[PDB]
Design an enzyme around this catalytic site. Structure first.
Site, PDB file in Angstrom:
ATOM      1  CG  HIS A 125     -14.556  35.941  -2.629  1.00 26.37           C
ATOM      2  ND1 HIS A 125     -14.887  35.602  -3.925  1.00 26.37           N
ATOM      3  CD2 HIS A 125     -14.741  34.823  -1.887  1.00 26.37           C
ATOM      4  CE1 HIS A 125     -15.250  34.330  -3.962  1.00 26.37           C
ATOM      5  NE2 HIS A 125     -15.177  33.837  -2.740  1.00 26.37           N
ATOM      6  CB  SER A 130     -14.862  30.609  -1.357  1.00 28.31           C
ATOM      7  OG  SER A 130     -15.703  31.736  -1.529  1.00 28.31           O
ATOM      8  CG  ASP A 169     -15.685  38.290  -6.341  1.00 27.57           C
ATOM      9  OD1 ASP A 169     -16.121  37.558  -7.261  1.00 27.57           O
ATOM     10  OD2 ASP A 169     -15.215  37.825  -5.283  1.00 27.57           O
TER      11      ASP A 169
END
EC number: 2.3.1.-
Length: 419
Positions: A135, A226, A133
């Protein structure tokens, strides 16, 4: 483990896929993107650096110091998760050198910029990044926030900011099936395990003196992606390590532009501006995009709000073209020193298509796309074009192309002098 097709950049030719170009299988279930994670190029054009400095200065005039959190790549931090082949192929020193040079350019623009290089090539039990991912994990966000906090303490005025004690506790597990893993599943039919990591929250503790500096109000605001979202607790770790309240205005999906634009469109921003503005984004955005700065610059002073307009009108939108403002009295309105302020009746209209006519028959078509997740009350603000040969022109008209337009939808536009 990846299928052969995954190795070709041309296979990533679509919207969904373009964010992953191209995926390589590292150790364990680690995947990396070659163009995003293993890049060696950082920064922006000379024009970008000028725009960044100009924005910083405008903010500084208003009493706001700017801190940029330039999130480092998965390749720079988690280099060691690479396969020996991939590690050999990834010019890590070149990437690190270019990154550090970019950090220096941020500083040269008058921007406070935490240096994350001590976190590079890490060996940690809790990996900075998720396996598959884009993030950071909460641990990654935490180690980052420790460094950022050290920068915050250097910022002029930080000592007067109200101080509190915060404590962070693990409150659950955070589940993530990574976007890279999902992309690889779509391409190859692969299947990867959902990751479960420690989830944290931060709370004030202790007594309710130093709590009352600057009258006690929070003085630090965070705008971001985010990555600054609640799930990773970046704002909470910032509070823990800095001792100051952090107003979180991050927008998930917002990218480089949306969070800061929505924040600076807000009333509270202009009523009580922060002493410090923290701005978080990653290394793949185009930092020179001119339509960003055309909004951000006049947004520092609330567009036309509180200030007298030379023209103002509210019209109901018809399908297609709507002439909204007409300088029919042929008043003196020089472009490169004028500003537009515009408000839809429906706050769910996240697109604005403008046409600006001048007294010489020339036209500008400015199209502003706003994030689906923000709410500025349908308000947009932008400077009239002041490129090399446009700043001089006399304004004649503003027209607005209708948006899946809601029925009854109207719009309010106004044009004002700039300070």
């Amino acid at each position: 483990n990846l299928c052969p097709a995954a190795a070709y950049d041309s296979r990533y030719n679509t919207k969904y896929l373009g964010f992953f170009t191209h995926l390589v299988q590292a150790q364990d279930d680690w995947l990396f993107r070659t163009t995003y994670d293993l890049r060696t190029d950082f920064g922006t054009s000379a024009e970008g650096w000028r725009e960044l400095r100009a924005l910083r200065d405008e903010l500084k005039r208003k009493g706001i110091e700017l801190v940029v959190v330039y999130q480092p790549t998965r390749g720079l931090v988690n280099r060691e998760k690479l396969s020996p082949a991939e590690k050999a192929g990834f010019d890590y020193e070149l990437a690190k050198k270019n990154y550090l040079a970019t950090i220096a350019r941020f500083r040269q623009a008058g921007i406070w910029t935490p240096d994350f290089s001590p976190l590079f090539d890490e060996k940690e039990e809790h990996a900075y990044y998720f396996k598959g991912d884009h993030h950071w994990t909460p641990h990654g966000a935490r180690r980052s926030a420790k460094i950022v906090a050290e920068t915050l303490k250097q910022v002029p005025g930080f000592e007067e900011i109200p101080k509190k004690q915060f404590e962070s506790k693990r409150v659950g597990l955070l589940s993530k099936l990574g976007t890279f893993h999902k992309a690889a599943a779509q391409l190859c039919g692969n299947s990867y395990a959902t990751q479960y990591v420690d989830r944290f929250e931060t709370e004030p503790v202790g007594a309710s003196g130093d709590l009352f500096g600057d009258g006690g109000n929070p003085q630090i605001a965070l705008v971001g992606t985010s990555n600054s979202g609640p799930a990773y607790n970046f704002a909470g770790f910032l509070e823990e390590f800095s001792g100051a309240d952090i107003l979180n205005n991050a927008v998930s999906g917002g990218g480089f532009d949306s969070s800061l634009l929505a924040y600076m469109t807000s009333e509270e921003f202009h009523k009580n501006p922060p002493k410090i503005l923290i701005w978080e984004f990653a290394t793949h955005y185009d930092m020179a995009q001119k339509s960003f700065y055309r909004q951000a610059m006049p947004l520092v002073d609330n567009g036309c709000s509180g200030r007298k307009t030379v023209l103002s009108r509210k019209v109901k939108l018809r399908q297609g073209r709507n002439e909204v403002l007409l300088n029919s009295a042929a008043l003196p309105i020089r472009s490169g020193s004028y500003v537009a302020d515009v408000t839809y009746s429906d706050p769910s209209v996240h697109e604005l298509k403008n046409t600006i006519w001048y007294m010489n028959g020339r036209r500008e078509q400015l199209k502003i796309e706003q994030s689906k997740a923000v709410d500025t009350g349908g308000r947009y603000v932008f400077q009239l074009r002041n490129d090399s040969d446009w700043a001089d022109q006399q304004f004649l008209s503003l027209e607005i192309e209708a948006p899946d337009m809601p029925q009854g939808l109207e719009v309010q536009a106004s044009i004002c002098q700039a300070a």
